[PDB]
Amino acid sequence: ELDXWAS
């Protein structure tokens, strides 16, 4: 899944 700081 996406990293904590992604998007």
Epitope: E1, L2, D3, X4, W5, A6
Partner: antibody, heavy 132, light 108 residues
């Protein structure tokens, strides 16, 4: 100044539980956005990512080692503990704990997420050998 | 899952050389990539964060470029302390995978 240091048993037998402790200073695990991860390096091989824990207590693990790993923090003692169960000889490696920066803030408000894209300060590493 | 492939896996050079090391991701990782230098018997040291940002206290000869799937680390004028192993790390997806490493040794 930020410093991290790993502690634990230098020798562990197969099927046993390995408890590793990352003692730190320079930051608090109660500071916004901060993370502490664990990375291993088997003799003469590449670095392998293991797990990470953040200030809000969110934890993430390597899918390959998920069932065997448990990461926890003790904010008051400035420590992060990694527990690896059912160890086998392939887990013989140097284990490193590392700091992850949170976003750069302006008056407490996050303005740059760039500094989070790395593990900036690392501990010396602890050499663990698994043999019966 | 996501694979980080480093190229070349081994490199030979001399003091004063300009070397480039490449790291390629199987899927787009935006700018979430870091470069580390690891000296024998020492922990990895951060060189570049966020693909191109120079880490504080790290010498000017190190520079990183690229975004998405193609990333490069260049050392302008190789110094004797640069003969080591280099690693790239992806931090856009969990797990935060590391590349296989690139060994930089003395040419002869």
């Amino acid at each position: 100044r930020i410093t991290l240091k790993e502690s634990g048993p230098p020798l562990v037998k197969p099927t046993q539980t390995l408890t590793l402790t990352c003692s730190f200073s320079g930051f608090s695990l109660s500071d916004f956005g901060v993370g502490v991860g664990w990375i291993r390096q088997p003799p003469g091989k590449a670095l392998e990512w293991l797990a990470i824990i953040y200030s809000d207590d969110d934890k993430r693990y390597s899918p390959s080692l998920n069932t065997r790993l448990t990461i926890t923090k003790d904010t008051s003692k400035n420590q992060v503990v990694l527990v690896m169960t059912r160890v086998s000889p392939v887990d013989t490696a140097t284990y490193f704990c590392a700091h992850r920066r949170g976003p750069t803030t302006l008056f407490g408000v996050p303005i740059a997420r760039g500094p989070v894209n790395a593990m900036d300060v690392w501990g010396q590493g602890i050499t663990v050998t698994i043999s019966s | 899952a996501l694979q980080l492939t480093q190229s070349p896996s081994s490199l030979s050079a001399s003091v004063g050389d300009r070397i480039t090391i490449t790291c390629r991701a199987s899927q787009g990782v935006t700018s979430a990539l870091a470069w580390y230098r690891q000296k024998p018997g020492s922990p990895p040291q951060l060189l570049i964060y966020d693909a191109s940002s120079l880490e504080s206290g790290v010498p000017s000869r190190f520079s990183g470029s690229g975004s998405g799937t193609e990333f490069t680390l260049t050392i302008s004028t190789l110094r004797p302390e640069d003969f080591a192993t280099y690693y790239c790390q992806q931090l856009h997806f969990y797990p935060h995978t590391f590349g296989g490493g690139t060994r930089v040794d003395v040419r002869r």
